[PDB]
Amino acid sequence: AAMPQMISLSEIEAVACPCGWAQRAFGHDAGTSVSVHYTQITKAARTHYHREHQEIYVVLDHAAHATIELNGQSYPLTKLLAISIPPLVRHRIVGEATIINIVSPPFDPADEWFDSS
């Protein structure tokens, strides 16, 4: 319970998600207070939001002109940009990118919501 854990994000089996591929660590079973994903943005995705989870993206690399959209506002991605996304904030990434997604509390896939067209 109070034991350190060690995981290689790059070696974790990658799973498909709407925006690309996710390598997820420290889920709810792990006892940690947050999940840590190493996520490859390869494809465009619906704008979405979370009702119970706040996310913090940390950009590790990105394609030129890649942006992030927060409540309909667009901002360019740069290296080591950190973005805090509280619950209810509509968000998505546009263009290719690699990020560390820090989720609290631990990530729960059930908590994904969309606005209709």
Q: Which stretch binds a copy of itself (CB under 8 A): 14-22, 44-52, 99-107, 109-117?
A: 99-107
Q: Residue 35 in contact with residue 24, Cβ under 8 Å? A: yes
The partner in contact with residue 63, picked from Cu ion, a copy of itself, none with C-beta cut-offs of 5 to 8 angstroms by kind, is: none
- Strands 35-41, 91-94: pairing is unpaired
Shortest Å, Cβ 83 to a copy of itself: 5
Residue 100 binding a copy of itself, by CB under 8 A = yes
> Omega into 4 within 30° of 0, i.e. cis?
no
The neighbour count for residue 37, using CB atoms within 10 Å, is 22
- 65 assigned to a ligand binding site: no
- 50 assigned to a ligand binding site: yes
Q: Which of 48, 43, 37 is nearest to 63 (CA)?
A: 43
Site of interaction with a copy of itself (CB under 8 A) = 1-10, 25-26, 30-34, 36, 38, 54, 56, 58, 60, 70-71, 75, 78-89, 91, 100, 102, 104-105
